[PDB]
Amino acid sequence: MERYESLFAQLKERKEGAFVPFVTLGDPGIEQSLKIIDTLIEAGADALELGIPFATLRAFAAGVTPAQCFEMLALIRQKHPTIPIGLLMYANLVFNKGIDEFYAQCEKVGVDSVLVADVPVEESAPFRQAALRHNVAPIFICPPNADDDLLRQIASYGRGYTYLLSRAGALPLNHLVAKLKEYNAAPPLQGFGISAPDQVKAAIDAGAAGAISGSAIVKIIEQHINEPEKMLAALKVFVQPMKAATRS
Length: 248
Hints:
Blueprint: H1 3-13, E1 18-24, H2 30-43, E2 48-51, H3 66-79, E3 85-89, H4 91-96, H5 99-109, E4 113-116, H6 125-133, E5 137-139, E6 141-142, H7 148-157, E7 162-164, H8 173-182, E8 188-190, H9 197-205, E9 210-213, H10 215-222, H11 228-244
Parallel strand pairs: 1-2, 1-9, 2-3, 3-4, 4-5, 6-7, 7-8, 8-9
Helix pairs in contact: 2-3, 2-11, 3-5, 5-6, 9-11
């Protein structure tokens, strides 16, 4: 079963767009991160975009280990079987534990897609192969100044959805979505600098299938770091308008 494809079909039937929040796995802590994610979903998130972070002092080797992240991912999958889960990270972590072993670990956990930020589409063969091999969808970024060549590649390689970078990352988003559709690329989601409901709305009118937001959610997390109860309430208040802006 392909989550994204299934999700997108349900949205298109309701003339609705997708709101995809982003949050780093483990912020502020494992316990909290899981509760902020439940809330994000409870508030209206159609899919999750999860960031994976990566002997002396207990403040140097801090952070959440890769193992803990996949453990969280598994728990999230268990409680929310249908929601598309895509990861965002750098090649580093994938190399550390082997490419095929990392994508296998994702297939085991249930992530639907992976986006390796620091890897050109030109040298992504080993990543695509390992992803396709484990039913994971390889995701590629599409810059607003991409030439026809790159568009044909990302369209033929990617699955699930394609990441449409904002001009603020250059042609109008309206023009890009058309080329992607012509080449039969996966649905596009805009993702840079969208922190307002009016910005989400514009993305969808321009033809995008959905929008992704990160910073706006992070700020709320750190502005209530020592107020968990109030933090979750502030997240809901922020997501409602964003998701609402995706409706017709």
